[PDB]
């Protein structure tokens, strides 16, 4: 079954760090970064080859204008929320995430969620067409918005978001569905009478992977770094197991991945 996702995330900061934009908005299709806007560049730009090739000029200019308009509203929001919380200076951050999921071409999720200072602020409930106030300072926002706007947002999440996701999926189909096999190394180092065995998988796509240590052929005291990105749109993971010196040969790393018809099996040599 064919599952695809469109997710936009946005941040407004009083304190991005030296030489960094206070305002950043990026989009992802199936977890792949494909567009980016920020307050320094003041333009939407491609982050994949496929969006770069297949979107027209009106796409880039249209969204740039929306992006510039949003920035101004978002600058104000941060200002408002600080004044509202009676705060002078310091470090404050507004965050938003929204988008839609399709399954066999049909919509299954539509969402819109906001945070202030790392915690939930509001979320849109598409069924009831209301906003939830997860904090008291979200009450004036819930009111201001519900006495339109909610009909507009519902339409965006069920119609606009879904038709564009279908379009993106068609534009990027080859790239989004690609596979790249992991390059795996087993590394052992002995210290304090413990043999630590490492299985490290490099350069896999897509993101999900399962890497297990087997002792005498049974799944095992492991520790995992989880899945972390490389710079090039592939992923990385490592898993360790503690063993007794001399028992190296009873251990075998198993890697299960969409790129591999049969699990990879790797040993310490």
């Amino acid at each position: 079954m064919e599952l695809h996702t469109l997710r936009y995330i946005r941040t407004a900061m009083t304190d991005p760090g030296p030489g960094l934009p206070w305002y950043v908005d990026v989009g992802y299709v199936d977890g792949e970064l494909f567009v980016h806007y920020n307050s320094t560049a003041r333009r939407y730009v491609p982050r994949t080859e496929w969006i770069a090739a297949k979107a027209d000029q009106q796409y880039w200019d249209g969204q740039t204008q929306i992006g510039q308009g949003n920035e101004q509203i978002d600058r104000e929001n941060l200002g408002i929320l600080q004044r509202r919380y009676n705060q002078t200076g310091g470090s404050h951050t507004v965050q938003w995430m929204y988008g839609c999921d399709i399954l066999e071409g049909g919509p299954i999720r539509g969402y819109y969620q906001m945070a202030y200072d790392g915690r939930d602020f509001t979320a849109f409930d598409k069924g009831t067409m209301t906003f939830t106030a997860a904090v008291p300072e979200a009450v004036p926002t819930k009111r201001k918005w519900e006495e339109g706007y909610a009909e507009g947002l519902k339409q965006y999440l069920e119609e606009t978001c879904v038709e564009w996701l279908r379009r993106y999926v068609e534009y990027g189909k080859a790239e989004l569905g690609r596979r790249e096999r992991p390059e795996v190394r087993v590394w052992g180092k002995e210290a304090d009478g413990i043999l630590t065995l490492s299985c490290r998988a490099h350069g896999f796509y897509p993101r999900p992977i399962v890497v297990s240590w087997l002792k005498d052929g049974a799944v095992r005291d492991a520790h995992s770094g989880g899945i972390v990105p490389n710079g090039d749109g592939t992923y990385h993971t490592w898993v360790t197991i503690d063993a007794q010196p001399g028992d190296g040969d009873k251990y075998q790393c198993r890697v299960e991945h969409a790129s591999l018809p049969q699990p990879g099996l790797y040993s310490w040599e």
Binding site: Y44, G67, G69, N70, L81, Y149, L153
Partner: peptide, 9 residues
């Protein structure tokens, strides 16, 4: 395609 912001918080 991104949301056009409607009004402030």
């Amino acid at each position: 395609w991104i949301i056009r912001n409607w009004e402030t918080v």
